[PDB]
Write a protein that binds this ligand. Structure first.
Ligand SMILES: [K+]
Ligand SMILES: [K+]
Ligand SMILES: [K+]
Ligand SMILES: [K+]
Ligand SMILES: [Mg+2]
Ligand SMILES: [Mg+2]
Ligand SMILES: [Mg+2]
Ligand SMILES: [Mg+2]
Ligand SMILES: [Mg+2]
Ligand SMILES: [Mg+2]
Ligand SMILES: [Mg+2]
Ligand SMILES: [Mg+2]
Ligand SMILES: [Mg+2]
Ligand SMILES: [Mg+2]
Ligand SMILES: [Mg+2]
Ligand SMILES: [Mg+2]
Ligand SMILES: [Mg+2]
Ligand SMILES: [Mg+2]
Ligand SMILES: [Mg+2]
Ligand SMILES: [Mg+2]
Ligand SMILES: [Mg+2]
Ligand SMILES: [Mg+2]
Ligand SMILES: [Mg+2]
Ligand SMILES: [Mg+2]
Ligand code: NA
Ligand code: NA
Ligand code: NA
Ligand code: NA
Ligand code: NA
Ligand code: NA
Ligand code: NA
Ligand code: NA
Ligand code: NA
Ligand code: NA
Lengths: 69, 191, 144, 151
RNA sequence: GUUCACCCACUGACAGGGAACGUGAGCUGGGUUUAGACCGUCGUGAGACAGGUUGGUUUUACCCUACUUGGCUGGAGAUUG
RNA sequence: GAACACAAGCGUAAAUGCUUGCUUGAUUAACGAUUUCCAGUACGAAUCGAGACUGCGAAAGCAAGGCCAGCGAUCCUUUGCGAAGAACAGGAAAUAUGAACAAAUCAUACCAGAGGUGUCAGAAUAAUUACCACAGGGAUAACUGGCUUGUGGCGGCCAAGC
RNA sequence: ACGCGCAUGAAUGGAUUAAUGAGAUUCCCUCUGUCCCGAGUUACUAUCUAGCGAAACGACAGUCAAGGGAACGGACUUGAA
RNA sequence: AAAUGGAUGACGCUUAAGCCCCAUGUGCGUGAUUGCCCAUUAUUCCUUUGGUGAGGGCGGCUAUAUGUGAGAAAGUGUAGCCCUCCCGAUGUAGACGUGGCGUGGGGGUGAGGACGAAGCCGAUGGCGCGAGCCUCGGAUGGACCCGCCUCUAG
RNA sequence: AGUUAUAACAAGGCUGGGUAAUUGAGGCACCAAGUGGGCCUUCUUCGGUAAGCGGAGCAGGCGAUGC
RNA sequence: AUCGAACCACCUAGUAGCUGGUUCACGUCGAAGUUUCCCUCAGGAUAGCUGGUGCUUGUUAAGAAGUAUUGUGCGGU
RNA sequence: GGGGUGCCCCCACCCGUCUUGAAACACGGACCAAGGAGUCAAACAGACGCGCAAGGGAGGAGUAUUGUGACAACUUUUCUCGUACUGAAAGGGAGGUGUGAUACACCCGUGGCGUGCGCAAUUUGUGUUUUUGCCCAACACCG
């Protein structure tokens, strides 16, 4: 016995029950894994220097406050 | 009639009573329900909300995590100020990986026996929640902490182990029957 | 208890939560793990990707007693000593002696910050554990 | 259900134009792309290499990767009850700079200019007023135009 | 076996249809359509054929209504005011 | 308005066509990323890259097949890589195991291909039943009824002709 | 009788045969209620009484016409008894 | 032009009760802006139930014998601690909740019975939205049985 | 330690100054049921002489619902 | 009184994607007949629709909208 | 006020089921009593309650007892799960900051960045510190 083949009826109603969720924000999953390697490798060396400078800045800020107290 | 197109899908699941059978918990709930509704302190309203949570949603904290968080705060204190009181709605457990802590004042639902010995031996105090309401109503000079939940074994099983970029641990009965070669494995990353 | 089951709630509903159209029948999909490669393929591939196939070498007559080797880290060495001994000894003083075989350990791994110097007797040791315990003022004595 | 390949409904989509055939000019070659820009994805159909799928023709997205002869763009795409952020790699010929933010940027430039001048407007037709015709005609639906609509 | 058709006669005339292709607890059982058996063609075979041939159980009404006859007896606020 | 192996579409003129010269980018490519089908799984196909060694060019540059259709899991079988030396010790550098230990064969593992499943997400497969059986199906035929009226039947309108 | 026989034919036996057959078919004589076209009579029933005394079946029930309806209603709508 | 007698629903209707349009109370070329009928709809009032609910009271000194009087629990859920206010209420397959109902037996606690237990009967009424509970009568019976908290199930 | 023959570009940071209507709760998980025969109508449509016929696109319904 | 394989007891409560049945009340919510794969088409697995449990937060909008405006792209009915 | 019987005007297709669709010319339906269908075990997962917590818990056995006695009490574990993972295997095995190119020296401690309950300190509502839990993106260390 034959039957139905295909229909898109009721599918738009189902998709909007819980809505079409908005896309993820642009700041959420932003990793350049497969990109241009020469630029990726260079950015790592800059980031390592930024982390080292961040640690040094907190050391001087803490020492200055302790001297005042 | 009314439209009511998205009215039902906005309701939040909110519970106003505790499933616990402990009568000492119910005495604390009664005390902080009174304080929450009569002092307009956001601290007191938070404590009452957390006392109604289930055991799974009140994770334990470690003594080492308390000592590190306390030090990161008190190092910026002024000349004449005093260290705050750490408050956890949950259990405090001892950590054998620190062994050297300053004097701490901690209020919690429960202390393990070893944790109580280490705190008292260092010069600190263990407090009950009825002691905190007695000496620090409205929660002045307090530090509120929660405790970790992301390291649990149940969380590691969430998801599907066979989809690209998953890193989910499968539910394995026979460990040797689910080994798989180094090749034929799913892709480890996906954008 | 039988009085807490769903059967007590379903007295008078005639279907017990199985529907009028597709009823409650016996084995509509096969018995056990049947059809794991034919009509249950998506479930197996999604959740148990390593089920089908072989991997690695074999080992007849395993005898698990020959590979007994529990490990303990340098960070947990305090739990094997008395409470007073942890703070009693430092650097050039007399140090407590810990024997790992009595406590049920074989290999000493070095992870984390060592609290107090001590003398540890072990069967196996690590590269990092050896270096860290030596700097702190302790030593490792090999056992058998 | 038969014959759904990579280029199914593309007879008129990838056709070039009338009297506008050829290959990309120098102005296209000299365009500069940098990460964070907005671009439009349109096919060229004279460059077979790096041509995107038919779904992404006419879509607008942001660039996340710059390569020696290619650009990577992030494009939204609704699937069932959600939109997926997709990444496509195309050649620089099938990519054009987007002008979807020039009005916004011009608004910002005007605001700072107005503040800069202040540191150193329009006529509403909606409101009423007097009207002096000096002449008035009449519309009357003459019988002549009824006879006109006879081919 | 037929419905159909075709011949022989009479007649004023020998029109066409419907009623669950009216009518099987009204009949009959020639046909169709089990099991036996023969022929032709087909099949290696068991067997097949809307091809031919011969033989092959037709069950129950005393119930309700309808219809046909047969009798008894109420009733005008159509049983009451 | 020609040609570009083949079906069709798109595309192309000092070329993507034709002739000619030289060549082997149809190799290898550290598990890089992505698109199409899509469950956002696999397979097939395709796009953008990093490294080695190269080809053609004076150069910029183009090329890891012939643009898009032309192909294949588990288990099993079979082939290739783990050349020779250097290390007082398994290390940034020497493939591993056969479990009491040694010498030489043999077998087995780890990585990359090949032998195929066209019912192409992949059981190893000939008939007959009128002597027939069971669970069901009005999800599905043969007879009544229902919609339709091609065909069948019965009639109008115009008027070239008889 | 005739034979270009869809597709007759020789122990997958061909042709022919007296006698025999609860075997299949056609015609003739005799005979008749098979029929034209039905009528009368008998015995046992049915029918009434005395004695005795079941079953099948049983949603609920039981007057029609048209309509619509799961496209043929006892129940529904309108009408008529 | 068709097959049982029969359908603008029927009767009937022709200064329509037919077809196409136009109006409206008391007063239709002098009251400009509602002729009238029918809903599980709308507005409004009362009651119930559930909330992503919103507010308020709860430290009991005003004075009072009998021959103006009763309550007030810091609370999810009950005979709801009490008083105001706002918003929703239908539903097959299906999910969940209930100091929700009922039955046999165990551990506790408190009662009942020869001045009549269980069982049985009913124009016996009362209470609850309901599952049900309780009183009454027997011109029934003649020896056991129940309320509440928990545990358990043929 | 990226580009350019080098001022200049890329990329990651630190320290000071100024900054499109009208409706309204945003985001993230875990566990599991039924279902996987549909049918009708508006408009757009393919096959068929046509069908209360077969097959699709958009939307609303019945199924699940009375009044 | 049993035969296209007798009767008796046992394995045996044989298996059935198929037919039939499945016992109290009120309350809060409430669908699907569609996608991919399967010797798959009267059945399953998988996603979607639904319920329960929540977590993190907020008090005018955070990563809000089956709707408009302005600007700027796409198309061959 | 409740209960019983009759009457009047109005309203009102037969229950259960499969099905897109049942009042059906679809199936099961004479009446009553008593029976009659999601149970027990074992492995795993999630929610909720309880004890303890870098540890948790035994089992089998044994010690002491007509007594509510097949109950109840008692016994760095002797076993198991976990605190460490990784490779086919031989095997190996995870702290921070600073300074140099089994390196060296210290140990009151979040590797750095972003969004982040509450608390602390300022201005008259704003800006700031520490940020818990969670999430995103870059290091580093182990195989
Ligand atoms: K290259
Ligand atoms: K098989
Ligand atoms: K004979
Ligand atoms: K189901
Ligand atoms: Mg279907
Ligand atoms: Mg239901
Ligand atoms: Mg169910
Ligand atoms: Mg089912
Ligand atoms: Mg008859
Ligand atoms: Mg033959
Ligand atoms: Mg190809
Ligand atoms: Mg049918
Ligand atoms: Mg012969
Ligand atoms: Mg012959
Ligand atoms: Mg004889
Ligand atoms: Mg009739
Ligand atoms: Mg309801
Ligand atoms: Mg019993
Ligand atoms: Mg249905
Ligand atoms: Mg059923
Ligand atoms: Mg609802
Ligand atoms: Mg049907
Ligand atoms: Mg019915
Ligand atoms: Mg009918
Ligand atoms: Na075009
Ligand atoms: Na197949
Ligand atoms: Na016709
Ligand atoms: Na005709
Ligand atoms: Na009428
Ligand atoms: Na079905
Ligand atoms: Na059985
Ligand atoms: Na198959
Ligand atoms: Na069925
Ligand atoms: Na049936």
């Amino acid at each position: 016995a034959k039957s139905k083949n295909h229909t898109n009826h009721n599918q738009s109603r189902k998709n909007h029950r819980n809505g079409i969720k908005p896309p993820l924000p642009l700041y959420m999953y932003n990793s350049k894994r497969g990109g241009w390697l020469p630029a990726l490798v260079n950015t790592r060396r800059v980031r390592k220097n930024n982390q080292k400078a961040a640690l040094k800045a907190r050391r001087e800020r803490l020492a200055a406050h302790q001297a005042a107290q | 009639g009314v439209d009511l197109t998205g009215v039902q899908k906005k309701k939040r699941v909110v519970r106003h009573h505790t499933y616990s059978t402990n009568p000492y918990i119910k005495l604390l709930i009664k005390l902080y329900k009174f304080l929450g509704k009569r002092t307009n302190s956001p601290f007191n309203k938070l404590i009452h909300k957390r006392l109604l949570k289930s055991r799974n949603n009140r994770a334990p904290i470690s003594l080492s995590r308390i000592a590190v968080c306390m030090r990161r705060r008190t190092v910026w204190l002024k000349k004449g100020k005093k260290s705050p009181i750490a408050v956890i709605v949950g259990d405090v457990l001892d950590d054998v990986r620190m062994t050297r802590i300053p004097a701490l004042r901690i209020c919690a639902l429960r202390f393990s026996k070893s944790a109580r010995e280490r705190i008292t031996g260092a010069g600190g105090e263990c407090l009950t929640f009825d002691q905190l309401a007695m000496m620090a109503p409205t929660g002045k000079n307090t530090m509120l902490l929660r405790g970790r939940k992301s390291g649990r074994e149940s969380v590691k099983h969430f998801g599907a182990a066979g989809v690209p970029g998953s890193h989910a641990k499968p539910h394995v009965s026979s460990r040797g029957k689910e080994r798989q070669r180094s090749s034929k494995r799913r892709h480890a990353f996906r954008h | 208890p039988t009085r807490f089951k769903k059967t007590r709630h379903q007295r008078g509903s005639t279907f017990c939560g199985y529907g009028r159209v597709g009823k409650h029948r016996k084995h509509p999909s096969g018995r056990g793990n049947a059809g794991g490669e034919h009509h249950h393929r998506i479930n197996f591939r999604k959740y148990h990707p390593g089920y089908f196939g072989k991997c690695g070498m074999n080992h007849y007559h395993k005898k698990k007693n020959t590979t007994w080797k529990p490990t303990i880290n340098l960070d947990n060495l305090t739990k094997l000593m008395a409470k007073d001994e942890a703070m009693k000894a430092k650097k050039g003083e007399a140090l407590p002696v810990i024997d790992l075989l009595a406590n049920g350990y074989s290999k000493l791994l070095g992870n984390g910050h060592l609290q107090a110097p001590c003398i540890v007797k072990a069967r196996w040791v690590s590269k990092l554990a050896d270096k860290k315990i030596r700097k702190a003022g302790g030593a490792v004595v090999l056992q058998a | 259900v038969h014959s759904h390949g990579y280029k199914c409904g593309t007879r008129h989509l990838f056709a070039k134009k009338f009297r506008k055939h050829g290959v990309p000019s120098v102005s296209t070659i000299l365009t500069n792309f940098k990460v964070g820009d907005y671009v439009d994805v349109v096919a060229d159909a004279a460059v077979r290499a790096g041509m995107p799928h038919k779904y992404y023709h006419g879509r607008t997205g942001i660039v996340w990767n710059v390569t020696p002869r290619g650009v990577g763009v992030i494009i939204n795409k609704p699937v069932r009850n959600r939109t997926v952020r997709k990444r496509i790699c195309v050649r620089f010929e099938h990519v054009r700079k987007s002008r979807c933010q020039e009005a916004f940027k011009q608004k910002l430039k005007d605001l700072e200019a107005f503040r800069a001048a202040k540191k150193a407007k329009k006529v509403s037709t909606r409101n009423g007023g007097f009207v002096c015709p000096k002449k008035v005609e009449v519309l009357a639906r003459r019988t002549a135009d009824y006879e006109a609509m006879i081919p």
